Amino acid sequence: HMKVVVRVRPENTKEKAAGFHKVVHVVDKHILVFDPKNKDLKFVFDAVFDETSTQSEVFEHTTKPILRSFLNGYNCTVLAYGATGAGKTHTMLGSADEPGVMYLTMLHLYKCMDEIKEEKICSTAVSYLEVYNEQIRDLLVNSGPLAVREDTQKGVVVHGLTLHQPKSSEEILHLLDNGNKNRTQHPTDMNATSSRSHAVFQIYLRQQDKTASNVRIAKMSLIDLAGSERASTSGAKGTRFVEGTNINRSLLALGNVINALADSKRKNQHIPYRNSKLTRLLKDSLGGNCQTIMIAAVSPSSVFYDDTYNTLKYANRAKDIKSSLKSNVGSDLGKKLLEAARAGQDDEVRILMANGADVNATDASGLTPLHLAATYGHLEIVEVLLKHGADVNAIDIMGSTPLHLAALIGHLEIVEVLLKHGADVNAVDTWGDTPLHLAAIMGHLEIVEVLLKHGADVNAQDKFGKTAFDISIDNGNEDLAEILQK
Amino acid sequence: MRECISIHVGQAGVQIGNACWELYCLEHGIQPDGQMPSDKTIGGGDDSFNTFFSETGAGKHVPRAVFVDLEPTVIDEVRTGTYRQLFHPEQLITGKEDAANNYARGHYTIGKEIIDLVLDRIRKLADQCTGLQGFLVFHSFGGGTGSGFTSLLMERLSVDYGKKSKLEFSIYPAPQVSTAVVEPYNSILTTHTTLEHSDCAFMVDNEAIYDICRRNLDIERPTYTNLNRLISQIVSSITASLRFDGALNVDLTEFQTNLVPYPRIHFPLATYAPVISAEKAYHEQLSVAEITNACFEPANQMVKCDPRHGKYMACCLLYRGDVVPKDVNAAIATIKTKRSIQFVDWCPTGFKVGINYQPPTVVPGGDLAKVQRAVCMLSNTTAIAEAWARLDHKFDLMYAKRAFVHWYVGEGMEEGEFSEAREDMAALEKDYEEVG
Amino acid sequence: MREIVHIQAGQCGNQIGAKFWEVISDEHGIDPTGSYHGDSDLQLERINVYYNEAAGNKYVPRAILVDLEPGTMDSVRSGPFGQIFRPDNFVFGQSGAGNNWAKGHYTEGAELVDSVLDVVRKESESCDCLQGFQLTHSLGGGTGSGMGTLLISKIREEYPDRIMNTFSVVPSPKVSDTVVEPYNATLSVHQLVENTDETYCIDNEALYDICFRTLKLTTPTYGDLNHLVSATMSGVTTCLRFPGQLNADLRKLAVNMVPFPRLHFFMPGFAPLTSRALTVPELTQQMFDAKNMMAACDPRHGRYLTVAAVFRGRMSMKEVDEQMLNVQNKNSSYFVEWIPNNVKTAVCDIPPRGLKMSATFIGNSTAIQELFKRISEQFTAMFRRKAFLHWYTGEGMDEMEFTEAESNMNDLVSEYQQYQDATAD
Ligand SMILES: Nc1nc2c(ncn2[C@@H]2O[C@H](COP(=O)(O)OP(=O)(O)OP(=O)(O)O)[C@@H](O)[C@H]2O)c(=O)[nH]1
Ligand SMILES: Nc1ncnc2c1ncn2[C@@H]1O[C@H](COP(=O)(O)OP(=O)(O)NP(=O)(O)O)[C@@H](O)[C@H]1O
Ligand SMILES: Nc1nc2c(ncn2[C@@H]2O[C@H](COP(=O)(O)OP(=O)(O)O)[C@@H](O)[C@H]2O)c(=O)[nH]1
Ligand SMILES: [Mg+2]
Ligand SMILES: [Mg+2]
Ligand SMILES: [Mg+2]
């Protein structure tokens, strides 16, 4: 379960003079009441901070407890959420006088690393970005709009984001400071401090045992979200309006992610991460393999009744987001013959071979001249290679044979020549695909017939249990399905 | 006497306005050019119809009306039409583009461009008034302008004219005529945003009017023109007292007094009779008794609900035409013996009565037969909660999925405004539950 | 909300684009010289949506013609209505794209894009109230898909308040130039998902299937496919080009049709299907039939989020209303219940040439996942083996960009699946 905390900021001078009763009432350190006797709603949280709360105290009951596990290779996230003016920028990046949770987090992390130098070697890689108007901008080095890309292996990565390697507490705190100044913050007369963008500081820890008698890696994300803005309550226009819209949409996106994640009864069901760049960055940080803490900031005043209620409903719902945690852990003439075979240079092939080039050379992936020639439709080089001792059934590190490749790309003549030279019609690659599967998927009907004529097994199934027939059915490919019908 | 200003917002508001003002002119003997032969005092006057019409030195009678739409197409028809010379041109305000069925576009993005201009034009009208009572506001729930812009207007009027009354004629959506899937959203948002700024709101269910037109008027496929004519007859009955110096509902404040004991529960159900085809004009004229009883037949209601299984908070009966007071008292005394009626604890069992002696008027195109006597019942019943429920339900279906919500948020709304709006509606349904 | 700027890019784009202008010009009674010679004022009431007025009675399409190869715009110029286009609005390069998305998006296409944007911006300046843009293109080639999607993002950046609509032709092996078409299509879908408000999915798979199985043409040409495209595009745009109050502008259509940001891919449908008079019951019936869809998906396999139906010709609006209520009643399961009243119908008095009555269907169906699944698997088959990667990486592209496009299109499919199953409330 994700950890959720509430920070009730002290009433400002604007709220004091009004003299409207306080809606937020702190009973226990766990319990808060929303609209006391009126709704009178009891909320249970992991921690609750009153108006007299210091930065140290918030830090003491948020990040500080998790910094041990971070060092032991556990992903961490702190995200400040809540309405405008509730005090999330105060909490996260602090004032000139009073340092925020980010500062304190980083200060204590480096102290910890210094105390355990003799037992463990630590290195940190850091980045600081801004989500502004559905665009990501690096806050450390002024890089342009950056693209967000996703693999099922590395997760979501920000392409072009500069990684820095601070070695002391004073170095990392300098980057923090550099970014805080680069962050888009517009000084308005109405609102002195209002965030226009979402600040995301990331820390990548690599940790090894000092004697190495297995490296532990972890990502810590510190997020200061901008708050939503009613275009009526504020009255924004121009660039400030667009800012408000983009922010509100990101928060809509975040809202949907929280709801879909929480008490979902549907872990098999889709989560709309891609609805916002913000929710894409936070994908690995919301209820996955991550210790996440929400600092939900609220005003105590009646003036922000609805705003406060909205925050609390979402904070409360975030508690139901479940997380499963885990500590992270030949020849020179060969190269030339490969390239030559790929490029379909018949003459260069002959010459390279005449000089004794290994016809069965492999690249880093285990591809041979025959594979490459078969792929890129160079019939003449295919014949030449086969005539001089090429392994017609060679496999790369992925199990692809020449025939797999000729079938995929749809080179009919090559497919025939391969078979006539004893290609395995039913070779299986690492994906469980045969030549038939590939020719089927790519809608090469003449190749399918030829493969079948040469004894292709119509009953062979891929990793997902699909035969060529199954594929044709699941595709509404009647032309294909018709031929496979027996 | 004391003047009332009419404001018409969006297509529905405007097109209803056309039908109302046409009917008003017909009722007071005013011509399309604003010339009223029967008015002998050319300069001005303290007359009853002057609540709704101002007077120019050329003997021209001018609606105390503002027409507002965010796109020009509809108001352009007014500007080019039979009744173009009726209005001062400044009273017909248009923008460049509409709100695209989006409350937020009407309330914020597009609406904020024109709001100040509109208030200036309204102010021009208020300055020609010796004692302004307040405003009658006509709009759809379902339109982007009807919902979003009305809300905005009502907010600004609460500030600029704090002590003035504000009454709505609101068009509740029906699938039969609707052209936007998001009409449930627009309706709820505008109900919540408007609630604290409105004294009394007369809802007209498009489905109800459609039904009446089909059933009673034998109209195969009702157009807006057909709907509007019927609506205008109901508006006319409601505003008659304001325009003909009656004894019941003599001013705007009295509507609240007579219909709204509890501020938030300010939605009277209108029932109207008789609605008869001209193809049946030759029939025997219906009596006071017959039309009074037709006020309790559900098929004659302006909003679909069941008052028989609900409780009344107030009930006015507004008679028009050849109506003898004693016959009214007879009919009303008789209603008790039909045992249909049940009132809330803290409220009196009285049916207030208004009689005006002006026979109903039908317009040139009308399908409605001219009758000697007609009645409109205004009853504040808890049954109308059923209308909110149906509407709240459709909201819930979509909002659960956040369907279409990005369109509103993309216009500078927070998701939270949907929650706030829906919760106020849940409270309103509870309000109706409690008084039961 | 008045003017729409039309853009056609690449071979396919310019082919179907031209045909569209041929067809709609006839409907609006405009000759190849740009002179009006029609019957009813109904043809001129909203001409400004597609055409500018020039000196004289001259109507000129608000159309911009783009290609990285010259050949196509020479054939466009020397076509039936070639003379009608503004000569300044032809933006052609010399090199070509060689069916390579990368060349379209990053190299050759990227160095012609500013020239196009100039013409767009010029056309834009002379608009009273710009609705937005419509782009016709193929997803399978280089120019249409690579440059087209680069164009789309540039226009989204420059005009963020305007509606972006595309007519996007999806590739098929049955009508294939190459086997890199899946790569090209998937890279574009990734672009379309982010940067478009409404995409009409025209599927060569479906167009072929229709020509081969229904029309019984042994070997269909591009002219045959394009005949179905022109009809569909005509029908889809009727509400924009003729008087009416439903889906009458681009924004109102979007608000009615698109419940969720990413789910903005529509299955076009048409009835009757003819090759070079139906009762309204029949017309309505055929619309919702799998055989008449322009995307190769079975509607019966999914659920409709929203539908817009458009009937053309002299017929009773009452009869239409009964017949559309019929379909929703008889087949209740095919329409999501959590969007009340999600089928909207419009009638237009003027039919298309050669038909007395016709119907066009625009469905936001979850069955479109079948289209995306078909492309996805072809993409994966190819990408697993890394075939032709050098074509793309050689133009400065990262391999990760392929992974990103794959991930996204699969997520789209999954997002569609959620709403096909999201009965529970
Ligand atoms: N009774 C009646 N209802 C109407 C009329 N015109 C529109 N409506 C209804 O009003 C709703 C549509 O709102 P409109 O008034 O057309 O919209 P609008 O206020 O112009 O707002 P936008 O066009 O979105 O800026 C639907 O429920 C229609 O059925 C009319 O003349 N009479
Ligand atoms: N815990 C606190 N103690 C004292 N003052 C506080 C506290 N939290 C906030 N404030 C004051 O409130 C002001 C605004 O808070 P701030 O943290 O900038 O809001 P925010 O939540 O970041 N707003 P926004 O970025 O627009 O969403 C600051 O300038 C502080 O003076
Ligand atoms: N329906 C249709 N598809 C076409 C046409 N011309 C090309 N295509 C398809 O478009 C794809 C190739 O893209 P194309 O537009 O030719 O290349 P580009 O000029 O680089 O954009 C393939 O899927 C072709 O089947 C045409 O006239 N009609
Ligand atoms: Mg802030
Ligand atoms: Mg309108
Ligand atoms: Mg007078």
Distance CA A170, CA C261 (A): 44
**What is the Cα–Cα distance from B110 to B96, expressed in whole angstroms?**
9
Q: Helix, strand, or coil here: B249?
A: coil
Q: Are C7 and C64 in contact (CB under 8 A)?
A: yes
User: What is the spatial distance between Cα A253 and Cα A279, in angstroms, rounded to a whole number?
Assistant: 7
Per CB-CB distance under 8 Å, the chain A contacts of B414 are 228-230, 248, 251, 310
SS3 A367: coil
The single residue of B3, B254, B411, B417 carrying the catalytic annotation is B254
Resolution value (Å, 1 decimal): 2.4
Of B270, B249, B133, B266, nearest in space to B200 by CA = B266
C72 CA: nearest ligand 3 atom = 19
Give the integer Cα–Cα distance in Å for B5 and B160: 14
Burial, C78: exposed, middle or buried (Cβ in 10 Å; 0-12, 13-18, 19+)? exposed
Q: Please tell me the distance in Å from A143's CA to the nearest CA on chain C.
A: 18
Interatomic CA distance for residues C277 and C272, integer angstroms: 9
Cβ of residue C252 closer than 8 Å to a chain B Cβ: yes
Say whether residue A153 is in contact with chain C using an 8 A CB cutoff.
no
Cβ pair A441:C377 closer than 8 A: yes
- Shortest-distance Cα residue to atom 7 of ligand 1: B12
Count of beta carbons in the 10 Å neighbourhood of residue A242: 16
Check whether C142 is labelled as a binding-site residue: yes
CA–CA separation, C348 vs C315, rounded Å?
9
B331 SS3 class: helix
Q: Which tokens belong to B260?
A: 């709204």
Query: Residue type for C85, please?
Result: F
Cβ–Cβ of C381/A275 closer than 8 Å?
no
**Is residue A260 a known part of a binding site?**
no
Amino acid at C291: K
CA A190 to chain centroid: 37
Among B223, B404, B413, the residue to mutate for chain C (most C Cβ within 10 A): B404
DSSP letter for C129, please.
Answer: S
State the CB neighbour count (10 A cutoff) for residue A118: 7
How far apart are the C-alpha atoms of A140 and B263, rounded to whole Å? 57
Cβ burial of A207 (10 Å; 0-12, 13-18, 19+) is buried
**Domain boundaries in chain C?**
3-259, 267-367, 370-421
Q: How far is the CA of B340 from the centre of ligand 5 (A)?
A: 42
**B41 close to B35: Cβ distance less than 8 angstroms:** no
Among protein residues, the one whose CA lies closest to atom 9 of ligand 2: A87
- In the residue annotation, B429 being an active-site residue is answered as no
CATH number of B269-383: 3.30.1330.20
Contact A306 B413 (CB under 8 A): no
Query: Between helices B385-399 and B416-435, what is the axis angle to 10°?
Result: 150
Q: Position B43: which residue type?
A: G
CB of B398 within 8 Å of any CB in chain A?
no
Strands C59-61 and B373-381: unpaired
Q: What is the dihedral of CA C244, C246, C250, C256, to 10 degrees?
A: 180
Tokens standing for residue B202: 């007369």
- Tokens 């899937």, located at residue: B181
Contact call for A431 and C384, based on CB within 8 A: yes
Per CATH, is C3-259 categorized as 3.40.50.10470?
no
| Closest Cα to atom 28 of ligand 1 | B178
User: Number of residue pairs across B and C with CB atoms under 8 Å?
Assistant: 70
Q: Do A252 and B406 touch (CB under 8 A)?
A: yes
By 3-state DSSP, what share of chain B in percent is helix, strand and coil, each rounded to 5? 45, 20, 35
The three state secondary structure string of B188-230 is HHHHHHHHHHCCEEEEEEHHHHHHHHHHHCCCCCCCHHHHHHH
Q: Is A195 in the pocket of ligand 2 (CB under 6 A)?
A: yes
Spacing, Cα B73 to ligand 5 middle (Å): 8
Round to whole Å and give the CA distance between B407 and B181.
Answer: 12
CATH architecture label of A3-318: 3-Layer(aba) Sandwich (3.40)
Chain C residues touching B394 at Cβ < 8 A: 340
Neighbours of chain A (3+ CB pairs under 8 A): B, C
Instruction: Give the CATH class of B384-436.
Output: mainly alpha
Q: Do C418 and A269 touch (CB under 8 A)?
A: yes
CATH of domain B1-268: 3.40.50.1440
- Is C143 known as a binding-site position? yes
Single-letter residue type at A336 = K
- Strand (E) or helix (H) holding C267: strand C265-271
The CATH code that applies to domain C267-367 is 3.30.1330.20
If you measure from the C-alpha of residue A188 to the centroid of ligand 4, how many angstroms do you get, rounded to a whole number? 13
Helical segments of B303-404, H only = 325-335, 385-399
The H or E element containing residue C133 is strand C130-138
- The length of chain A is 486
Say how many Å lie between the CA of residue B226 and the centre of ligand 1.
Answer: 14
Question: What is the position in ligand 1's atom list of the atom closest to the CA of B227?
Answer: 1
The distance of C211 to chain A (nearest Cα, Å) reads 14
Domain regions of chain A by residue span: 3-318, 332-483
Distance (Å, whole) CA A261 – CA A318? 8
Buried b (16+ CB within 10 A) or exposed e, B175-195: eebbbbbbbbbbbbbbbbbbb
* Residues facing residue A69 across a β-bridge: none
The Cα-based distances of B135 to B18, B151, B166 in angstroms read 17, 14, 5
CB burial readout B3-40, b (16+ within 10 A) else e: bbbbbbbbbbbbbbbbbbbbbbbebbebeeebebeebe
Q: Report which of B173, B232, B207 is spatially closest to residue B365, judged by C-alpha positions.
A: B232
Ligand 3 atom 5: the closest Cα is on which residue? C12
Q: Which CATH architecture has domain C370-421?
A: Orthogonal Bundle (1.10)
Name the residue with the closest Cα to ligand 1, atom 5.
B12
Residue contact A230–B412, C-beta within 8 A: yes
For B285, phi then psi, to 5°, come to -55, 135
Q: Where are the extended beta strands (E) located within C295-423?
A: 304-313, 343-348, 357-365
Provide the annotated binding site of B for GTP: 10-12, 15, 71, 99, 140, 143-146, 179, 183, 206, 224, 228, 252
Instruction: Report d(CA B115, CA B110) in Å as an integer.
Output: 9
Tell if the CB–CB gap between B71 and C1 is shorter than 8 Å. yes
C399 annotated as a binding-site residue: no
The protein residue with its alpha carbon nearest to ligand 2, atom 26, reads A194
Chains with 3 or more CB pairs closer than 8 angstroms to C?
A: A, B
Atom of ligand 2 nearest to the CA of A297: 21
Q: Which fold has domain A332-483?
A: 1.25.40
For residues C268 and C295, the answer to whether their CB atoms sit within 8 Å is yes
Exposed, middle or buried, A20 (CB in 10 Å: 0-12/13-18/19+)? middle
CB contact under 8 A, A232 and B409: no
Experimental method: X-ray
Chain B residues whose beta carbon lies within 8 Å of the beta carbon of residue C342: 181
In chain B, residues 163-192 whose CB comes closer than 8 Å to chain C:
175, 178-182, 184
> What's the CA gap between A119 and A116, in Å, rounded?
5
Ligand 1 atom nearest to B206, measured from its CA: 1
Q: Which two tokens stand for residue C241?
A: 């080009």
Q: Which of C7, C11, C145 to mutate to test the pocket of ligand 3 (most atoms within 8 A of CB)?
A: C11
- Domain locations in chain B? 1-268, 269-383, 384-436
Q: Is B220 on the interface with C (CB under 8 A)?
A: yes
CB atoms within 10 A of CB C322: 12
Contact (CB, 8 A) for B222 and B214: yes
The one-letter amino acid at C150: L
List Cβ<8 Å contacts ≥24 apart for B340-348: B340/B296, B340/B308, B341/B312, B342/B311, B342/B312, B343/B311, B343/B312, B343/B313, B344/B311, B344/B312, B344/B313, B344/B382, B344/B435, B344/B436, B346/B261, B347/B261, B347/B312, B347/B313, B347/B314
Neighbours of A465 (CB within 10 A): 8
Min Cα separation B104/chain A (Å): 10
